[PDB]
């Protein structure tokens, strides 16, 4: 059928469809080409998605959702699950060691939810959007991730789509996907392009080369827990603060107090976008006591100023990668909400010698854009023209040798779909099993990185020790996504059991079939 683009982002998603050979960016049915990303469950036992559920709020916080794209792929230990939680309104469980989310679904009845389920609502939600404009059912996306996101985030964005009942054709990094909507119809020569996209909750910079319809990542580096949410945060504990200081009382631990809060912080960060000071104003904030204040642009930047500045490290490491100067970018695309902020357009010009980023480009939609072009192209669309994609793994995948060592099996930057084959044998003899634990990233131990998963080969036939050679392959598909498999060299296939945190098969079938009763 019709194969559509889906934004999926943390605060706002957005839905494309390539159509007479053009993008049509789906307006809503509130007529908003961005969807908030919010889900609720009002007292009376209504779902709620996208402007609905936010406009309800403050006055339902414990029972709206949000910020699931920071929850899904990571553990309930996770310091930056904890660090969110503190301004979340809804009870955040550990369940099968990762952040589950606990509700009034209506009528005083609990439910739990994996926060694929709520990402899974918000898409739903995109899909219904697209399904009014197009007069058809959709039944297959392109959906968006962070070029950073690790494996686990990426799994649990494709079983998002899984369990709304779509068929995700390919999952696309995010600064790619801008780099198609800046590139698309361009004949301007071989390019080197810096794509800075800061959003609602993940910062990414890839550098691309685009030559014609052809685009290749040669370098990516960012942090999927840094944009919006962050610097909304910043200024919730700034107000939180001040009303301690003013009357001696706390406020953290009441929602409708901190969720208020939110609401007027929002607001005032998009008007200090055009304004130098904005007012913040609740009338029923603590204890029947209304909140009256100013926040100045200059003081928004100051409690801001360490995050913002983090933006520049992954933007040298990129250029490091690609063996490239700052003079040697050719076009800056500014892409992400965040990225309407003055000083963040000041420090990325600034860090550029006073380069002007490209116009024409709408941050919030530029992602769905180039997600509904590739959509295009997977539904053999030959209007699109000639569109090439080469992508790359933006973590180095390792094992753990002797002394705790981060040994690498694929670096980071490497063009995707990639594999690599090693042998294993056995520690002792007899032994039927050998474990092998893979980690992402680049620090020198294995501890200091992210463990991706254990893999279990297993039914290894009777021998001494070191007798066995097993043939393990590692490949990244075009998604990003490890598959792991095993051979023996001395019955050929080895059966691998894995553990990388994932939904379980049986939790993904009754996901899915709960997802199809509304």
Same mark, same amino acid.
């Given at each position: ?25 789906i ?8 969807? /908030? ?10 779902r ?15 029972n ?10 990571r553990?309930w ?6 660090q969110?939680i503190?301004?979340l ?12 989310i606990q509700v &009034?679904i209506?009528?005083?009845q ?23 404009? $197009?007069?058809?059912?959709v ?15 990426? !799994? ?12 995700? *054709? ?11 909507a ?40 960012? &942090?999927?827990? $840094? ?10 504990e ?37 304004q ?5 104003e ?15 642009r200059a ?5 801001? *100023? ?12 990129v250029?490091?990668?690609?063996? $490239? ?9 500014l ?6 902020? /003055? ?14 980023? =490209? ?14 072009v !590739? ?8 209007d699109?023209?000639? $569109?090439?994609?080469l ?29 690599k084959? !090693?042998?294993? =044998? ?5 032994? /039927?099993?050998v474990?092998?634990k ?12 992210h463990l991706l ?18 043939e ?24 691998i ?22």
């Amino acid at each position: 059928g019709t194969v559509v683009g889906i934004d999926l982002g943390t605060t706002y998603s957005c839905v494309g469809v390539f159509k007479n050979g053009r993008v049509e960016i789906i307006a809503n049915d509130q007529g908003n080409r961005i969807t /908030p990303s919010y889900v609720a469950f009002t007292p009376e036992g209504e779902r709620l998605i996208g402007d609905a559920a936010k406009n309800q709020l403050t006055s339902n916080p414990e029972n709206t959702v949000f910020d699931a794209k920071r929850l899904i792929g990571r553990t309930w230990n996770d310091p930056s699950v904890q660090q969110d939680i503190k301004f979340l309104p809804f009870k955040v469980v550990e369940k099968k060691t990762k952040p589950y989310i606990q509700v &009034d679904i209506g009528g005083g009845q609990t439910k739990t939810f994996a926060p694929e389920e709520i990402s899974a609502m918000v898409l739903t939600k995109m899909k219904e959007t697209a399904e009014a404009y $197009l007069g058809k059912k959709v039944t297959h996306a392109v959906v968006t991730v962070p070029a950073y996101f690790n494996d686990a985030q990426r !799994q649990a964005t494709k079983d998002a789509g899984t369990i709304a009942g779509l068929n995700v *054709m390919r999952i696309i990094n995010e600064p790619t996907a801008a780099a198609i909507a800046y590139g698309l119809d361009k004949r301007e020569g071989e390019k080197n392009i810096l794509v800075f996209d800061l959003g609602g909750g993940a910062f990414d910079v890839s550098l691309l080369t685009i030559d014609n319809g052809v685009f290749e990542v040669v370098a990516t580096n960012g &942090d999927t827990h $840094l944009g919006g949410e962050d610097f909304d945060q910043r200024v919730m504990e700034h107000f939180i603060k001040l009303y301690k200081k003013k009357t001696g009382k706390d406020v953290r631990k009441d929602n409708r107090a901190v969720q208020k809060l939110r609401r007027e912080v929002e607001k005032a960060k998009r008007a200090l976008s055009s304004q130098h000071q904005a007012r913040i104003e609740i009338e029923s904030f603590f204890e029947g006591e209304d909140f009256s204040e100013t926040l100045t642009r200059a003081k928004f930047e100051e409690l801001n *100023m360490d995050l913002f500045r983090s933006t520049m490290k992954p933007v040298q490491k990129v250029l490091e990668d690609s063996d $490239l100067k700052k003079s040697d970018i050719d076009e800056i695309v500014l892409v992400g909400g965040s990225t309407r902020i /003055p000083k963040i357009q000041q420090l990325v010009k600034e860090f550029f010698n006073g380069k002007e980023p =490209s116009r024409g480009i709408n941050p919030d939609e530029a992602v769905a854009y180039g997600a509904a072009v !590739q959509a295009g192209v997977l539904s053999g669309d030959q209007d699109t023209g000639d $569109l090439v994609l080469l992508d790359v793994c933006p973590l180095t995948l390792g094992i753990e040798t002797v002394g705790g060592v981060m040994t690498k099996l694929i670096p980071r930057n490497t063009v995707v779909p990639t594999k690599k084959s !090693q042998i294993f =044998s056995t520690a002792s003899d007899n032994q /039927p099993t050998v474990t092998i634990k893979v980690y992402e990233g680049e620090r020198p131990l294995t501890k200091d990185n992210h463990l991706l998963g254990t893999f279990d080969l297993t039914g290894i036939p009777p021998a001494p020790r070191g007798v066995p050679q097993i043939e393990v392959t590692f490949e990244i598909d075009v998604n990003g996504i490890l598959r792991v498999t095993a051979e023996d060299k001395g019955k050929n296939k080895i059966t691998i059991t894995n553990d990388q945190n994932r939904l379980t098969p049986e939790e993904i079938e009754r996901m899915v079939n709960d997802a199809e009763k509304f």
